[model samples]
Each structure stands twice: as structure tokens, then as C-alpha cells.
Target chain A: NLKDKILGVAKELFIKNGYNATTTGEIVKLSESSKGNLYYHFKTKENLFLEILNIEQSKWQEQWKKEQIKAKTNREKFYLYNELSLTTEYYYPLQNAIIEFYTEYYKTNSINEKMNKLENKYIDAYHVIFKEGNLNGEWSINDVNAVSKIAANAVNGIVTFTHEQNINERIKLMNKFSQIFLNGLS
Target chain B: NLKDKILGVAKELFIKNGYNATTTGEIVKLSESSKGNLYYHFKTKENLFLEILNIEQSKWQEQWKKEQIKAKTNREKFYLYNELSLTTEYYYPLQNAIIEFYTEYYKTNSINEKMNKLENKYIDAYHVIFKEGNLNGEWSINDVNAVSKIAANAVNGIVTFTHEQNINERIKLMNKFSQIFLNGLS
Candidate 1:
């Protein structure tokens, strides 16, 4: 229960101020736990941050898979991904924190490896989409691996832009860029 | 003469072993400079690293502009960029150190802001390329800003990938992914 409460408050603070700014002291105070108790639950702030990332990662994957299933056409699937990607960023604000954490601690630990696997899965989803498009004669993507890399980076880049913009413009820019990826600019 | 020799040797060491691993001691040893002289020249290893980056950035821009002018077609220009981008990564090994430095020192120092400005220049180059393509009837790209974001990220991602692979494979993969970005899957 204390762990849950600590994580609950930690997540909130982490999302608001970011990973580096959000402190264990703040989490302890917000959760009404002593420093000793906080340390007893989690060894360090990094440890606590990783746990928060694990929980968020699980939730994100489940939701992403559900939405990926809901889209009918290949183009719709691609657009659905950008929409859901931005929605996740807006709701969690974990993307910036994750980037910060990985940047600070770039060693190939279990968590880092897990994050790399997650990134690979993101690229793999696009690979499948492009491959399916090729098989069904929807698109003539000869190099699934290459196209997947471009699509993943494009979608991620667009999602990052939308994260900075206001609510109204986010949807507008997301769709606009998503189309650029689906059909070439020309 | 001593300053250039120190910087030259320091660049080689930093490129080979990375930022953190390449010690001031090693640089002093290799450059045949006294600790006092090294300190006189560069206040810190970080300062020296930034100097190397400055020199490399200038070289990269000059070479990039030369090639951009030399290309007959906009398509060739786009491909020229990808070719050059990955080539820089393979030869310089500066990408990892740059990412590491920014990650560890996440502050709004002069150095940090300079890095941001340099990044913006990188993206701006792509935006202009796409815009010129539109003007020349080479491509129908409407959103130069959006396409630049995508292209910049795509190129950066590819450069990053080439950092890990061998020489032959890097060229092969670079060409494959560059095609995906220029003409896309379709």
C-alpha cells in the first residue's frame, strides 16, 4: 500500500516537473512517508523512476495493441498510431523523462535493454504494416526494413512536435505529417 | 602550435574512446603538453571537446554546402546528404559523445544553447532543400517545416545506426534508408 501510494505520487511529480527536477524528498512528503520508509521501499530515486517507467510501459503497450487492432486499413493504422502516440505523450509526459533518464544512464543494463527492445517493437509494428501493404498491393514498399525505419522516425518526430503545441494545433499537425509519411510529399 | 597539437591529439582520443573514457591525462601524454599548459589552453576537458565540435561542425557545413551545390538534381542532393551524414558519423564518432554530454549536462548553459542552435541549423538545411524541391518542380512537398522535421530525424537516426555497424554494411543500409526517406515506400 505504501509502495503504491509512493509510486502514485512519484508518477504525478515525475510527469509535472520531470525526472531530474522531481526529488525523492518531494515524493516522500507527498506520500506522507518518512525518508527511511521511502528508502526501504525503493533503494533510490532512479530505482523508483524505473518502476514508474515499467508500469507506464506496460499500460502503453496494452493500449497501443488495442488501438492497432481497431484500425481497418493500412493508412488508417498508420494515422491511428500517430494519434495514439500523441495522446499517450499528452497524458503521461513520460517521453521527456524517459529521454532524460536514458541519456543520463546509457549503460546497457536490463532496463536499458528492455527500452531498446521496446523501440525495436515500435519499428517492427511499422515493418509489419508496410509488409502487409506490399502483400495486399496497397503500396509498393520493396524494402520493409528501410520504410519501417523512416515511418517510425517520422511518426516519432511528429509526435514530439505535437507534444509542444497547444491542443487544437496538435491534431492538425499530427494528421498533416502523418499523411506526408503515408503518401510521399509529391 | 602547442594548442593545435593538443586539440588534434585530444580529438583523436575522444573520437576513439569517447568523452568520459578519454582522460585529460591521456591527452596530455599523447599531445606532449604539460597539465599546466593544457589547462591554460582549455579550462576543462568539456571546453576542449566543445572546441573540437566547433571545428567539426564548420567542416561538416562547408563540405555539405559544397556537395549540395555540386548535385544536379534535388533527388541527388537529398541522397548526397544521407551519404554525407552517415559518413560523418562513421569517421568522427562524435555523435555518441555529443549525446552523452547533453544528457549528463542537462542545463541551459552557453554550450547547451549552442548545441540547440546547431541542431536547428541541421533541420533548417533540410527544410530549405524540401522547399527548393517544391519550387523547382522536383517534388510537391507542401509542408517544408514538417518534412524537414521528419527528414532531420530520419537522417539523425540513420547516422546513429551507422555508428554501430561495419563500413560495408553502413553504406548499404544508409543507401537503403535514404531511398525510403527521399521517395518513401511508394
Candidate 2:
């Protein structure tokens, strides 16, 4: 529980102030944990950051798994995707930090491999969604890979793009995008 | 001619090794330009990079300006935007370099101002295209700002996202994204 609490505070600070700007001292101060306790939990700040990302990724994966099972139709599952794209509000802005980390560690084979694997998981989820939709006659895509790539980017873009928009506004824009994706303008 | 030769080599090297990994000696050797001549043309490597970005942006702006005039309809112009998004092959891969420069020199007001202004130019172009489409009944979007933001990101995303795809495949992907953005799935 203490470790989780430390992670929670660290994630919040990292997202707000950026990973590069946020210090371990601040995390210790805010989480009310001693430096000894924090170091005991995670040897380095990088480890803590990596753990937070792991936690987030598995949570996202688990949610995707549940949604895949719960949706009655492929179309519905795609809608679920839009829902997450526009409004899931993970509210954590570690994406830029993730890119920074990737750039910093690109020379490290292990880091590069791990990052690619995480990204592939997201892409695979998208591929399955697109493939299922196409097979079910819901989508008329010629190349599933191309369409899924765009869809994945669109969803990813929406998460960061809609930062300035309110919840209602974000939902509305996603619906607009969803409508355009589902049916063309007459 | 000598300046152009130097830029050509520098752009290639930067794409492969990133800005930090690239060096003046490598560019000088490859371009067959002397250090005195290189420095005469560019005060520093940063200046050389800024010039490269400036040249690239102007080339894009000029091409876009041409498309704006040649496109018969707002709908066609939007489609043109989609085309540029998917298949632009200036492919120098300096985005990471740009971010690094931004972070390192953000305190330098001139650098910050220049980058923001260049980015705003693209946003302004999107705003005009979307507004024109709405006024001409080419689109029924309620929030032009919101849609344009997504459009800008789509184009930006496409620039980076389709790096691995060949021209024909990139075109197909852009067409898919364009279809979804312009019309619905139906």
C-alpha cells in the first residue's frame, strides 16, 4: 500500500510538472514518505516511473480485454474505442514524458524493446478491432493494416489533441469523428 | 550551390543520426565543404538546422499555397491536405531534434517565438480551410476550431506515422483516413 501510494503521488506530479522537472524530493514530501522508504521501494526514480507506466499499461490492457468481451457487435466495440479516445480521461499526461524517455534511451536495447512491445500491444488491439469489424461486414476497408494504423493514430491524437476541450466538448468531437468514420457526409 | 550541397548532406546525416549524434566534421566531409565556408554560411549547427526547417516549411507552404489556388472546391482542398499528410517524403526525421532544441533553448525568447509562429501558420491554414468548407456547405461541422485541431494533428501524425510506408501504401492509408474524416463509414 505504501509503494502504491508513493506511485500515485509520483504519477500525479510527473504528469503535472513533467517527469524531467519533477524531483524525488517532491514526491517524498507530497507522499509523506522518507527517502529511505522510497529508495527501499524502488532503487531509482526511473524504476518508479517505469513501474507506473507498467501499471497504466496493464490497466489499459485489462480494460480493453473486458470491452472486447462485452461489446455485442464489432461496430459496438469500435464505438467503445471512440468512447475511450474522447472521454476515458486517464487524465495522466505521461505521453510526452514517454517520448522523452524513449528518445533518451533509444540506444539501450532493453528499453527500446520494452517500449516497442508496449506499443505493439496497442496496435494489436487495434488490428483485432479492425479485423473483426471488417469480417463482420461492418467496415469496408481494403487494407486492414492501413485503416487500423490511421484509426490508432486518430485515437492517440485525440487523447492529446483534446486536452483543452471540456468533457462535453471532447465527447461531441469524438462523436463527430465517429460519425464521419461510420458514415460519410451526404 | 555550395550552400545547397552542404544542406543536402546535413539533412541526410541529421535524419540518420539525429541532431545531437550528428557533427560538423561528418557534414563537412560528406558535403566536401570547408569549415570556414560552412561557418560563413551558418553561424552554428543550430542555425543550420533552423535554416533547414525554415527551408522545408517554406517549400511546404509554397506547395500548399499552390494547392489552395488550384483546388476547385473547399472539399478538394481538404482532400489535398489529407494527401500531404500521408505521402510527404521530406523525411528528415528532425522532430526529436526540434523538441530537444525547444527544451534546451526555451528560455531564449527568439527561439520560442519563431517556433510558435511557424506552428501557428499551419493552424491558421487549417482554420481557413475548415471555415471555408463550412461556409460553402462542404462541411457541417459545428466547431471549426475543434475539427481543425484534429485535422492539424492528423496531418502532423501522418507525417511521422507513415514514415515506414511506401508511397502507394501511404496514399492508401491517407485515403482511408481522409474517407473517415470527410465522410462516415456508411
Candidate 3:
């Protein structure tokens, strides 16, 4: 329970103040837990942050698994995934903080590998959907991996670049993005 | 020349150490310039970073203008733009630093305005190409602006996400991305 409390408090602080700005001492103080307990539960601040990210990743996959079954087609699932990303809090709740953390620790190969694995999870999800689309004759995709990566990347760009826009504007932008992904300009 | 010297030194430092980590004090120390001189040229650290971004923006536009003339088709220009972004330093030399700066000062309206204007310039360039594509029969685009925004966003995603890959790999990714933009999955 103490570990859970520490995780909750740390996630809040990280989301509020960003990765570099939030300190372990602050987390300890806010969680009202001893530094020893914090260290015992999570070996270091980086480990704590990683654990939180792992939890979010699991939660996101779990939610998407439930949401995906509702869609009749893989194409619909693509739009559904994008819509849920915008409408739900489970998808990238610590988006800004994760960006900060990645920028800060990108040079560290171990951390980079960890973060890249998490990113690949999203791409892997898209890969499955795109592969399904191909199987169902939705599109003759020559390279499923490439399309999946592009789709995931475009979704990330849409979500991040339109971060300051209102929800309506974001939904419109995403719908347009989905249209482009499915149909393209030509 | 003092101002140019300071600018060069500051850009290098920011690129090397990132925006938040590189202080004006360090810039002054490294450039062999006094704080007063730095302040006289650029009022604040934010302004200094802004000036750097402004210069990069101008350089990007100027280079693109020259490159666009070489391309016969508007679609060629689109690939050219994405290629230049990956190959040249003019496009986003301080991308990491800019992300850090944005995360640090995004809440400041003036800074956000300045940054957004710079970003819009990229979209504007894409707008022209997409419009030309429609005219030249390269594509029957319905909403030129929306397609342009999507294209630009996808190109950006390709570039940023492929930051760690080799140039050959990055080129492959961008080419695939361009294919998706011009054609579509369906």
C-alpha cells in the first residue's frame, strides 16, 4: 500500500512539474513516507518513474483490448484508437513529462532502450491492426511494419502538436488525420 | 561581430547541453563576452533562444526556396522538403533544445505565439505544395489546408521519431512516409 501511495504521489508530481523538476525528496515529503521506505520500494527515482510508466502502459493496453472488440473492422479500430487517445486519460496521461524525461535521458542507452520498448508497444499495436486490415482486404499493404510505424508516428504528432488546441479542434484534426491515413491525398 | 560571436557560442552550447541546462552565465564565460554585452544584444535568455530559432527558420525557408525551384513537380517538392529536413542542419539544428525550451516556457503566451508562428511557417510551405499538386493533377485534394497539415505533421513525425536511426534508415522511413501521404493505405 505504501508503494502504491508513493507511485500515485510521484505520478502526480511528475505530471504537474515534469521529470527534471520533481525530486524524490518532494515525493517522499508529499507521500508522507520515509525516504528509506521510498528507496526500499523503488530503488531510485528513475526506477520509480519507470515503474509508473510500466503501469500506465499496462493500463493503456488493457483499456484498448476492451475498446478494440467493439469495432467491427480494423479501419474502425484505427479511428477508435485515435479517438480514445484524445478522449481518454489512460492514453499518455504523462505525455509531456515523458517527453521531458526522454529528452533528458536519451543519451543513456539503457534508458533509451527502455523508453524505445515502450514506444514500440504502441507501434506493435498499430502493426497488428494494419496486418488485420491487410488480411481482411481493407488495403493491399506492401509493408505492414512501415505503415504501422507511420500511423503511430502520425498519431503521436497530431496529439502532441495540437496539445494546446480545444478538444473539438483536436477531434477535427484527428478525424482529418485518420482520413489521410486511410485514403491519402492522391 | 560580438553579437554574432555570442549567438554562435550560445547555439553551440544549447545544442550540446540543452536549453535549460545551458545558462547565459555559461554562454558569457565561453564566448569571452560580458553579461552586459549579451544583454544588450538579446534582452533575455528566452530572446536569445528565440533569435536562434528565428535564424534557423529563415535559413530553412531560404534553402527550401532554392531547392523547390529544382523540382519539376509539387509532389517532388514535398519529398525534397522532407529529404532536406533529414540531411541538412538548417531545418532544426536545435530540435532537442527547442523541445526543452518549449517545455520550459510553453505557458508563456508570448513565447508560445512566437514558436507557433515558426511552426505555422512549415505548414504554410506545405500548403503551397499541396495546392500546386491539386492544380497540376498530381492529386485531387479536397481540403488543401487539411491535407497540407497532415503531410507536414507526418513528415515531422517521421523525422523526429527516426532521430536515432542511421541516415540510410531515416531516408527509407521518410520515403515510405511520403508514399503513404501521396497514396494512402486504402
Candidate 4:
């Protein structure tokens, strides 16, 4: 219960001031918990941050995974993306943190592959939705591999823009963009 | 010149330590100057910071103009994004400052106009190269318009990723993206 309270407060602070700006003391104070209690629940701020990240990240993936299970084809996947999401506003923050985490992993001298599993999980979602047309012969594979890459990047880019303030304008244009991408595939 | 030096130093320090953490005295020291010099240049820290952003926004537009000039065709316009210089890396201090500036702009209501302008620029660039194709009956008018939107988003998205990390890997993939996009247009 203490841990939940801490996370409850931590999420509020994290969303407001950003991850780097937040402090354990602030979390502890807001949660009315001692340092020992906080540490007992989570070892370090980074550990706690990652715990929050992992939970948020996994929840995001799990929601999408469930959607794809009910989906049968490429076009369905595009519609799935368009469906209203409770986590729409938070998606960019999660993606940004994960990508930044992976880039840091890539740069490390020992080449930590720890994040690759998570990275692949995200990529696989796009690949699954994207592969159907090519596999089923419904669409011509002019350049299947590159289309997948462009789609992934464009989606990530859209998510990035969505994380920014005043992104409603971009959201308004997504339907027009969907016509370009989804139509290209169909 | 002395005023510029002050602004430059402030920009560097602000980028390094963030605005709240970066003190005015440090800027004076880094500039090898005095507070009086900085005050002569700008009234407050915010003014100095905004001046840097004004300079950067113009520079981005200017660079785009140069890239546009050398790019004679629609395909070449996509190619030109790859050629953007990384002089920003050498001046990350300035780069970070502008990033912060853009982040702020993204939050403001004023961003709508610039975002619209950007979309328009991409639309117009395509007309330069595709007009002849339309006239000669080489490409469908719809395809030309459709491809332009995808090309614009994909090209801008590619350039944004180029700034993220690992130039070796990103550049290789980005080169293929440029190729695939142009080939798709054909």
C-alpha cells in the first residue's frame, strides 16, 4: 500500500516535472513515507523509475497485443491504431524514454543488449500488421521491407509529435495521412 | 560583438546546465566579461535565450532555402535532407538550447501557423518536379498528390531521426529510405 502510494505520487511528479526533474525525497514526502520505507519497496530512484517505466510500457504493449489478437489483417491493424486510446497522450513519453534508453544501451562500450528484447516487442507489432498484405498476395510487394521501415518510423514520428504541446492539429491531420499510408498498402 | 559574446556564452551555459541551474555570473565569467556587458546586450536571461532561438529558427529556414535551391527535382528534394550538415554536434550547447526553444514553441498556440506553413512547403516542392509529369501524362494527378504527402512526412521524419543517434546505422537505413521513397514515387 505504501508502495502504491509512492508510485501514485511519483507518477504525478514524473508527468509534471519530467523524470529527471523529480526526486525521491519529493516522492517520499508526498507519500508520507520514510526513506527506509521507500528504499525497502524500491532500491533506487532509477530502479523505481524503471519499475514505473516497465509497468507503463508493458501495459501499453499488452493493450495493443490484445487488439492485434482480435485483428485478422493489415488494414485491421491500421484501424486499430486509429481507435481511441486511453493512453494516447502518454504514448510518446513511453516511446521517447524507451528509444532513448535503447540508444544509450547501443552506445555503451560493452554493448548492452538488455533492451533489445523490449525493442523487438514493439517492432514485432508493426511487422505483424504490416506483413499480412504481402504474405496473402492481396497487395503487390513493390518493396515490402522498406514499406515496413517507413511505416514504423512514420508512426514513431507521429507519436513523438503527439507528445508535444498543441498536437491536436497533427491529430486532426492523421486521417489525411492514413489515406496515404493505408491506401498505399491496400 | 561583445553583446553577442554574452548571448553566446549564456546560450552555451543554459544548454549545459538548463536555465534555472545556469547562473548569470557563470555566463559573465564564461564570456570573460561582466554583468554590465550582458545587461547592455539583453535585459534578462529570458531575453538572451529568446534571441538565440530567433537566430536558430532563421538559420533553419535559411538552410532549407539553400537545400531547396540545389534540389531541382522532387526526388532530389528528398535527397537533400540527407545532406544536412552536423555542425550542430560541434555546437551541442547551442543545439540543446534550440531544442528547448522548439519544445516551448510546441506548447504554444502559435505553433499552428508554422506547422501549416511546413506542410505547405512540402506540397509546393512536389509541384515543381511533378508538374511536367502531369502535363506529359506520365503520372496520375492523384498519385502525384498522394505521393507528395507521404514523401514530405517520410522525408522530414528521416531528417529528425538522423539527429537522434548512431549516424553509421541511421545514415545507412536512411539512404535506403530515400531510395525507396523516390522509387515509390516513380
Candidate 5:
């Protein structure tokens, strides 16, 4: 409960002033918690941010586990992602926040020393979904790993470029983008 | 000749240090010209920066135009772009520079006006290829204008992501991506 309170405080400040503008001091004040408590819970400010990010990321992973368990085939998950779930849209903000928080997380004195470890974490997350689909015999993906990573970045970029259009319009574009990455122009 | 010389110097400095870190004075210094000489050619530093951006954007436009002209049909241009030109890889360094430029570009300026204009300009440029593709009965898109914009941004994100991967590898992904966009998900 206390950790949730701290996270809630962090999100409030982060969304309001952006990642850079929001500081530990503001979080401490807003959370009505002592620096000692926050520091005790998190080794550094960077850890504190990453902890929050992990909360968001883990939720997606949890849902994905459930999605995989329910879906018998990769093609099922692929179609389910578009029809039944908001895999991309549900956590787009947090996904984008992680992308934004990366710079601070990678800073010195940050606990994210094993940065490259995560490169696979993301690449593999989507790869599993696509590989599952490939094995299902519904799709004929020659390179699931390469295609999945491209789809991942393209999805993130879709969110990044949302400033150019409204969310509804962007979601429409996002849907088309995903399908395009899945299929091909040939 | 003087204007080109000044822009060339500014481009290097800006790419290296970004817009702010590289002062107009330094530009005058690097251009090997006096202050009056520089201002006479470009009235202001922002104007100079915009000119460089315009040049690069127009260059992007020209690349599209040249490809559009050589292709026998819209399908040809769409397919040919997969390997015929590499404005994506070629623009990497400039894209790096613009990424650096945007932070400062947003700070002192209202990029909304120009950014929206350029987004629309990109769409307009894309229409030359898109409308033709529509007429050729390839995509059969109900809204060519909307798909054109989506296609433009998706291609950008795909190729940008592609550049990060192995350059020696064949870029068969774009062919796949565009093919999917034209067709349905397989």
C-alpha cells in the first residue's frame, strides 16, 4: 500500500511536468513520505523510476501470459490482439514512458547496469507471440524475430507520432501499421 | 556560393553541437565570412536553419519524384522503393542531426505551424505516388489521403528501425511490410 502510494505520487508528478521536470523532492513532498523511506525502498531516484516502469511493464507481461494460456495458437493471439485485447493501446502510455525514462535510467549511479539484458526482454516478448503464430500454421512468417522487432518499434513509433493526429485517428493508423508489418506489399 | 558555403558550415556544426551550442558567430567564423556578409546572405540564424531543413525536405521530395518518374506504374514505384533508393540509410546522419535539432527547435520556436505544414507536404508528395497506385488498382484504398499519410509514417518508422539492424543483411522487410499494407494480414 505504501509503495502504491509512492508510485501514485510519482505518476502524478511525472504526467504533470514530464519526467525531467518532476524531481525526488516533489515526489517526497507530494507523497508526504520521508526521503529516508523512499530511499530505503529504492536505492536511487533512477531505481525509483524503474520500479514504477516495471509495475506498468509487468502488468502487460501478466496479461500476455494469460493471453497465451487462453489462446491455443499464435494466429489466435494475433487475431485476439486486434479483436479482443488492447495489447498495444492499453499500455501505450507506459510503453512510451519507458522509452522516455530510458535516458534517466541509463544515467550513472542508476541501478540499470545490465542494460543490454533488457534488449532481449522486449525483442523476445513479441517474438514469442509471433513465433507462436508461426507454429500455428495459419501464418507463414519466414523470420518471426526480425519481423516482430520491426513491429515493436513501429508500434512505439506509432505512439510517438500520435502528436500529429488524434488518438482515434492514430489507433486507426496503428491498426493498419500492425497489419502491414504482419503481412507485406507483395 | 556564399549562401551554400554558410549553410554547409552551419550544417556540420549543427550536426555536431546542435542548433544552440553552435552559435551564429561560430557559423560566421566557420563559413570564413564577416558578420555582415553572413546576415546579408541569411537574415537570421533561425531562417538559416529553416533553409537547411527545407533543403533536406525538398531533397526527400526530389528523391520520391525521381523514383515516381522512372517507374512504369504506381506498383513499380512502390516495389522499386524497396531497393532502388536508400534515402533512409542516407538520411541517418541528418536524421540524427534533426533529432538533436528538435529539442532546441521546440524550445525557442513554435514548430506546430511548420511541422503541420511539412506533414501535409509529405502527404501531398506521397499523393503523387499514392493516387497513381490507387488508379492502378493495387491498394484499392477507400481513402487514399488517409492511407497515404499512414503509409508515409509507417515506412519512416520501419526503415529507421531497419537502419539499426545489420546493414549487410538484405532489406526484404520493407517489401514484406508494404506488401502486407497493400494486402490483408496473412
Candidate 6:
């Protein structure tokens, strides 16, 4: 319970105040936990931040898995993917903190490895979808790996630029993106 | 000649050492110019960086204009655009410094305005190509502005991710990007 409380408080503070601005003492105070308990749960503030990111990633994967099972076609899968991406509450909240953290610790090999793992996970997901589409005769792709990267990059671009827009605007932009992406694939 | 010398040295230093790491004193020393002369030519280091960025933008535009005239079709224009993007030596050299400069002064309204203007210039170029394609019946695009943004965003995504790759690799990636983009447009 103490660990969970600390995590909850830390996640909220980090999301609201960013990685550099949120302090361990403030997290402890806000969570009503002792410094010893906090350190016991998370070795450092960076560790706590990483844990939060891992939690978020797991949550997104779980949600996407459910959507994937329900989709009848690869096209539907992509639309669902973009829709969930745009509508998900968990996606961009910690983006500022993550960017700050990554920029700060970019030189650390461990940090770089962890970030690369996260990026690979997303790219791998796209790769699977593209391969599945090819198998289903939805699109005849010569290079699945390259196409997957292109698809992932385009979605990333859309998300980066349109994250500040409202739900409707974001959805519209993603729809246009999907249309272009799907059309291009075919 | 003094102004040109200062500009040349500042650009080289900024590209090699990034925005924050390259000092005006170092720039003056490297350029063999006085502090007063540097200040007379450029009000601040930030101003000098902006001038360099503007120069790069103009150079890209002039080169692109020449290529556009030689392109026989909209498709050729798109390929040429991407090929030039990959082959251009001026594109990514100062990217690190520009990112640092923007991150440091992002809250400044004037800096924000200048960046926005630069971004719009690129988008406008895309808009022109898309409109030309529609006029030439190369593709049937319903929303030219939205499509232009999507196209620009996709190319940007490709460039951001693959800027570190070799020219050949970059060209391959851009070719894949153009294939997907043109296919989607059609």
C-alpha cells in the first residue's frame, strides 16, 4: 500500500510538474510516505520515473491487445490503433516528463538501451500488423520492415504535431493519416 | 567581409558544438574578429543563429526551385524533392544546435513566431506541389491543405529518424517514403 501510494503520487507529480521540476521530497510529502519507504520501493527518482513509464507502456499494450482481437480486418486494426492512440488518456500525459528525462540522461547507456527497447516495441507492433496485412492479401508489400518503419514514423509524426489539438481534431487528422497510409499500402 | 567572416565562423561553430556550447568569444577568436565588430554585425548569438537558419532556408528554396523547373511531372517533383532532401549537405548539420536553441527559448514569443513561420514555409511548399498534382490530374485529393500537412509531416518523420544514416540509406528511406506518399495520394 505504501509503495502504491508513492507511485501514484510520484506519477501525478511527474506528469504535472515534469521530471526536473518534481522532487523526491515533494513526492514523499504528497504521498504521506517516509523517505525510507520511498527509497525502498524506488532506488532513485529516475527509477521511479522509469517504473511509471513501464506501467504506462503495459497499460497501452493491454488495451491494444483487446482491440486487436476485436478487429475483423487489418484495415480496421489500423483505424482502431490510430483511434485508440488519439483517444487514449495515458499516452501524452507523461510526454513532457519523459522528454526531459531522456534529454537529461541520454548519455547513460542504460537509459539509452531502455528507450531503444521501448521504441522497438512500438515498431515491432507495426511490423506484425503489416505482415498480417500482407498475409491476408490486403496489401502486397515487398519490404515489410521498411514499410513498418515508415508507417510507425508517419503515425509518430501525426501524434507529435497534433497532440495539442482537441479530441475531434486529433481524430480527424488521424483519419486522414490512416487514409493516406492505407491507400499507400494498397 | 567582416560580416561574412563572422557569419561563416558562427555557423561552423554552432553546427559543430551546438547552440549552448559555442560561445561568442570563441566565435570571435575563430573568426579573427573583435567583440565590437561581432556585436555590430549581429546583435546577439541568437540573432546570428537565426540569420544562419534563414540563409539555409533560402538556399534550400533556391535549389528546390531549380529542381521543380526540371521535373516533368508531379511524381518526378516528389521524388526529386526527397532526393534533394537526402543529398543536401546543409540540412542536418545545424539540426542539433537548432533544437537546442529552440528548446532554450521556446517560451519567447518572437522565437516561437520565427519557428512557426519557418515551418509554414515548408508546408506551403508541399501545398503547392499537392495543388499542382490535382490540377495536372496526377491525384485526386479532396483536402489539399490537410493532405499537404500530412505529406509534410510524413517527410519530416522520415528525416528526423533517418538523419544520422548514410546518404545512400537516407535516400532509400526517402524513396520508400515517397512511394508510400504517392501511392496514398493516388
**Which predicted model would earn the best DockQ?**
3
Please give, as one word, the docking class of candidate 4. acceptable
Error of 6 at A31 (Å): 7.1
Predicted complexes: DockQ each: 0.16, 0.27, 0.53, 0.29, 0.27, 0.40
TM-score, B chain, candidate 2? 0.64
lDDT digits (tens) for residues A1-186 of candidate 5: 677888888866654444555788888886777878765667776677666656655666567677666767665565344332233433445433443355334345334454434445555666777776666665777777666765655555555544445656765766665555555512
Global lDDT of model 2: 0.68
Candidate 5, residues B122-151, lDDT tens digits: the string is 667556667776676666666667666766
**On a 0 to 100 scale, what is the lDDT of residue B52 in model 3?**
85
lDDT of 1 by residue, B1-186 (tens): 889899999988876776768899999989999999999988888888877877877787887888788788777788888777777665456655665554444443556655656667777778878878888877776668866766776566555432333667666766765665566423
* Candidate that beats the other on DockQ, 2 or 4, i.e. the better one: 4
Best by TM-score: 3
User: How does the DockQ of candidate 3 come out?
Assistant: 0.53
**What is the full ranking by lDDT, best candidate first?**
3, 6, 1, 2, 5, 4
Given candidate 1, what's the lDDT at residue A135?
A: 74
Q: Please give, as one word, the docking class of candidate 3.
A: medium
Model 4 spans with C-alpha error above 4 angstroms: A37-41, A65-72, A82-90, A93-113, A140-149, A162-168, A182-186, B15-20, B28-44, B67-70, B82-93, B98-165, B179-186
Give per-residue CA lDDT, model 4, range A1-186, as digits (tens): 888788778766665554455677898887778878755658756566656665665667677766666657666665556432323544445443333333323345332233334445445655666666667665665655555555566656554544543455555444445455565443
What is the C-alpha lDDT profile of model 1 across A1-186, one tens digit per residue? 888888889888877665676887788887778877756658767778877777776677668887797888878877887778777743246655655565456464655545555556657768877888777677777667766765665566555433433665666666765675566522
Query: What are the RMSD figures for all models against the true structure?
Result: 6.4, 7.7, 2.9, 5.1, 5.8, 5.0
Order the candidates by TM-score, highest first — what do you get?
3, 6, 4, 5, 1, 2
Error of 1 at B72 (Å): 4.5
Q: What pairs collide in candidate 6?
A: none
Residues B67-118 of candidate 4 have per-residue lDDT tens digits of: 6678665456555654343333324555444444444344355554555554
* Every prediction: chain A TM-score: 0.77, 0.76, 0.83, 0.68, 0.76, 0.80
lDDT of 2 by residue, B1-186 (tens): 889999999988887777767898898889999999999999788788777888878877888887677688877787777776555543437666664554444446566556666666667777888788778887676777767766776666555433444577777767667767777522
Q: What is the number of backbone collisions in each predicted candidate, taken in the order shown?
A: 0, 11, 0, 0, 8, 0
**Fraction of the real A/B interface contacts present in each candidate?**
0.19, 0.47, 0.52, 0.12, 0.36, 0.56
Q: What's model 2's lDDT at B132?
A: 85
True-vs-predicted CA distance for residue A173, candidate 5, Å: 1.7
